[PDB]
Amino acid sequence: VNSFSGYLKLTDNVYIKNADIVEEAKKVKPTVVVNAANVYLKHGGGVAGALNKATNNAMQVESDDYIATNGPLKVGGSCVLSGHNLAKHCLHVVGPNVNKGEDIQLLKSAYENFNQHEVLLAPLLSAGIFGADPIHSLRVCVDTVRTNVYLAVFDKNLYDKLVSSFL
Numbered sequence: 001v002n003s004f005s006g007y008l009k010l011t012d013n014v015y016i017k018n019a020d021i022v023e024e025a026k027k028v029k030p031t032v033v034v035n036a037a038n039v040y041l042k043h044g045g046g047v048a049g050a051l052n053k054a055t056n057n058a059m060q061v062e063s064d065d066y067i068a069t070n071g072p073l074k075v076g077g078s079c080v081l082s083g084h085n086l087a088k089h090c091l092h093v094v095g096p097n098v099n100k101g102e103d104i105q106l107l108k109s110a111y112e113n114f115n116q117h118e119v120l121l122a123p124l125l126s127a128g129i130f131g132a133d134p135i136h137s138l139r140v141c142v143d144t145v146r147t148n149v150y151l152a153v154f155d156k157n158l159y160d161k162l163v164s165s166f167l
């Protein structure tokens with residue numbers, strides 16, 4: 001039993017809800033919130049910009065130190081950093097950004113990072129401003145993640161389309 005509320009159950013391990021991931025994190029304080037990161041951990045817009053804003057830029061300050069020490073992530077890769085006021089940990093995961101010409105096949109590799117954590121709050125990787133089809137992202141999620149994932153879909157219209165089209 002966990003404290004996630006109001007989710008529709010899609011499979012044994014995947015749950016979905018129309019929600020603002022910032023507000024969800026602030027309410028649940030999950031062990032792990034997933035950020036839709038880029039390789040530079042520059043949290044400008046979309047989920048990343050919103051999460052970082054909610055931390056009063058502390059996420060960005062921590063991320064800049066991480067990059068200065070370690071260099072950029074790989075597309076499809078991840079790192080674990082602090083969750084600040086939102087969660088115990090933030091798993092920064094880089095899905096491919098179609099608006100940059102990156103290979104959509106890397107979306108499965110990106111979701112594989114979730115399997116290192118028993119329970120996660122997360123957005124659909126590569127969706128939104130990353131330019132992929134969210135219906136495809138949900139399919140890859142369900143077919144790749146084996147741990148318990150609670151997906152927050154900000155756009156209510158998109159949420160209804162994902163539910164109604166889910167196979």
Ligand SMILES: C[C@H](c1ccccc1)[C@@H](CO)Nc1ncnc2[nH]ccc12
Pocket residue numbers: 019020021022036046047050123124126127128129130134152153154155158
């Ligand atoms: C599927 C979602 C989306 C939103 C709008 C237009 C199309 C798609 C997603 C895409 O990355 N973005 C978010 N999801 C959850 N919580 C969020 N908080 C701030 C952003 C955000």
